[PDB]
């Protein structure tokens, strides 16, 4: 496996764009046994019309044709927000865009293509938190053939309580 991007590894948390900025997706640091553990997180479950975007850094294609994308994340149960939260979602979306040049900070939703809805096998229920039984999901998708010099991945939150803990992008060589 040839790793193109690895969020959880030692500096993978740098260089990501969030749009809109200030509310949506948020880089947070947990600490476990003195190890910093970073995540992109969002939980705007109480207001509708959520459209929050998280975009990776420019990633070079090299000789990759089909890339594999591994996501690790938790999703908080919508029923754990007392009284209702009717706009709460339990999924998020995976997108990408190819390009021959670096866009810098110029991100546009419309230039991106949807890969798939990403859905947890295991929701984390209310009691799971105190039980220290938080449920980590692993989901893999692939895209291809890629032909451009580079590419971006992006994550649309539509109103779920998601913690994106790991994002690993690789292709198969030999």
Give the separation between CA 75 and CA 135, rounded to whole angstroms. 8
Spatial CB neighbours of 104, under 8 Å, sequence gap ≥ 6: none
Which residue range is the domain that position 86 belongs to?
1-174
Helix (H) or strand (E) holding 130: helix 126-130
Residue 71 contacts residue 6 (beta carbons within 8 Å): no
69 neighbors 59 (Cβ within 8 angstroms): no
At residue 83's C-alpha, the angle toward residues 77 and 72, to 5°, is 15
Q: How many domains does the chain have?
A: 1
The answer to whether residues 157 and 90 touch, using CB atoms and an 8 Å cutoff, is no
Exposure letters 58-93 (e unless 16+ CB within 10 A, then b): bbebeebeebbbbbbbbbbbbebbeeebebbbbebb
How far is it, in rounded angstroms, from Cα 25 to Cα 52? 7
Residue 115, domain CATH: 2.60.120.260
Q: Which residue has the tokens 């580079």?
A: 150
Residue with tokens 């230039």: 111
Buried b (16+ CB within 10 A) or exposed e, 28-38: eeeeeeeeeeb
d(CA 111, CA 114): 10
The secondary structure of 67-128 as a DSSP string is: EEEEEEEEEB-GGGSTT--TT-BS-EEEEEEEESS--TT---GGG-EEEEEE--SS-B-HHH
Experimental approach = X-ray
The first and second tokens of residue 93, run together, are 């979306």
141: Cα within 13 Å, side-chain hemisphere: 16
Residues whose CB falls within 8 Å of the CB of residue 4, separated by 6 or more in sequence, listed in order: 59, 60, 62, 64, 67, 169, 170, 171
With a CB cutoff of 8 Å and minimum separation 6, the contacts of 42 are: 24, 25, 26, 52, 157, 160, 161, 162
Q: Contact, 161 vs 76, CB < 8 A?
A: yes
């Amino acid at each position: 496996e040839v790793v193109l991007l690895d969020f959880a590894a030692a500096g993978g948390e740098l260089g990501w764009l969030t749009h809109p900025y200030g509310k949506g997706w948020d880089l947070m640091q947990n600490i476990m046994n003195d190890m910093p553990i970073y995540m992109y997180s969002v939980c705007n479950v109480m207001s509708g019309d959520q459209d929050n975007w998280l975009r990776t850094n420019w990633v070079y294609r090299g000789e990759a044709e089909r890339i594999f994308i591994e996501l690790k994340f938790t999703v908080r149960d919508c029923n754990s927000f007392p009284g209702g939260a009717s706009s709460c979602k339990e999924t998020f979306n995976l997108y990408y865009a190819e390009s021959d040049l670096d866009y810098g900070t110029n991100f546009q939703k419309r230039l991106f293509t949807k890969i798939d809805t990403i859905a947890p096998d295991e929701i984390t229920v209310s009691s799971d938190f105190e039980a220290r039984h938080v449920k980590l999901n692993v989901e893999e998708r692939s895209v291809g053939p890629l032909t451009r010099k580079g590419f971006y991945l992006a994550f649309q939150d539509i109103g779920a309580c998601v913690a994106l803990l790991s994002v690993r992008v690789y292709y198969k060589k030999c």
